[PDB]
Motif scaffolding. Structure first.
Motif, PDB file in Angstrom:
ATOM      1  N   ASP A 187     -12.015 -19.792  16.200  1.00 13.04           N
ATOM      2  CA  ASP A 187     -11.102 -19.045  15.341  1.00 13.04           C
ATOM      3  C   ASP A 187     -11.737 -18.718  14.000  1.00 13.04           C
ATOM      4  OD1 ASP A 187      -8.725 -19.129  17.069  1.00 13.04           O
ATOM      5  OD2 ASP A 187      -8.620 -21.263  16.544  1.00 13.04           O
ATOM      6  N   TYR A 188     -11.393 -17.549  13.475  1.00 12.65           N
ATOM      7  CA  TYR A 188     -11.869 -17.096  12.175  1.00 12.65           C
ATOM      8  C   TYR A 188     -10.601 -16.674  11.432  1.00 12.65           C
ATOM      9  CZ  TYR A 188     -16.373 -16.641  14.652  1.00 12.65           C
ATOM     10  OH  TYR A 188     -17.511 -16.858  15.398  1.00 12.65           O
ATOM     11  N   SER A 189      -9.982 -17.617  10.728  1.00 16.74           N
ATOM     12  CA  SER A 189      -8.743 -17.343   9.998  1.00 16.74           C
ATOM     13  C   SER A 189      -8.816 -16.154   9.053  1.00 16.74           C
ATOM     14  CB  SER A 189      -8.300 -18.581   9.211  1.00 16.74           C
ATOM     15  OG  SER A 189      -7.879 -19.618  10.082  1.00 16.74           O
ATOM     16  N   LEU A 190      -7.715 -15.410   8.993  1.00 16.36           N
ATOM     17  CA  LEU A 190      -7.596 -14.236   8.135  1.00 16.36           C
ATOM     18  C   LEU A 190      -6.228 -14.317   7.442  1.00 16.36           C
ATOM     19  CD1 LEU A 190      -8.806 -11.662  10.808  1.00 16.36           C
ATOM     20  CD2 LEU A 190     -10.163 -12.558   8.905  1.00 16.36           C
ATOM     21  N   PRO A 191      -6.008 -15.373   6.638  1.00 16.14           N
ATOM     22  CA  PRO A 191      -4.764 -15.629   5.902  1.00 16.14           C
ATOM     23  C   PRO A 191      -4.408 -14.623   4.809  1.00 16.14           C
ATOM     24  CG  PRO A 191      -6.444 -17.003   5.035  1.00 16.14           C
ATOM     25  CD  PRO A 191      -7.027 -16.378   6.281  1.00 16.14           C
ATOM     26  N   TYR A 192      -5.425 -14.043   4.182  1.00 17.67           N
ATOM     27  CA  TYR A 192      -5.223 -13.073   3.115  1.00 17.67           C
ATOM     28  C   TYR A 192      -5.245 -11.658   3.670  1.00 17.67           C
ATOM     29  CZ  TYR A 192      -6.228 -17.057   0.120  1.00 17.67           C
ATOM     30  OH  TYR A 192      -6.172 -18.297  -0.480  1.00 17.67           O
TER      31      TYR A 192
END
Lengths: 49, 49
Positions: free
Chosen positions: A31-36
């Motif tokens: 996974d490569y989080s993209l919260p913003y």
């Protein structure tokens, strides 16, 4: 109720892998989080490292 | 009565395995007794153990 003898069968609804070879599929997911809205992202994992 | 010469033949009704390769099939069978109406049963033998 009628404990009669049945026919031989290779069709095991689900025989244990402890008794015979059984196929399994469990691909690892990275996974490569993209919260913003605008995220800081890295290059895909270099599995060879 | 007529001890005459016969033709060569590979068709041995049953040649000994001491003279040539011979196929055999003797699968081992594992029994799991069920003497009672409600039996205590184990998981299939783990042949890899």
């Amino acid at each position: 109720t009628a404990a009669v003898t049945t026919a031989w069968s290779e069709q095991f609804p689900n025989i244990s892998a402890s008794s015979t070879s059984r196929d399994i599929n469990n691909p690892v997911i990275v996974d490569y989080s993209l919260p913003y809205f605008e995220n800081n992202v890295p290059k895909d994992v270099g599995i060879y490292d």
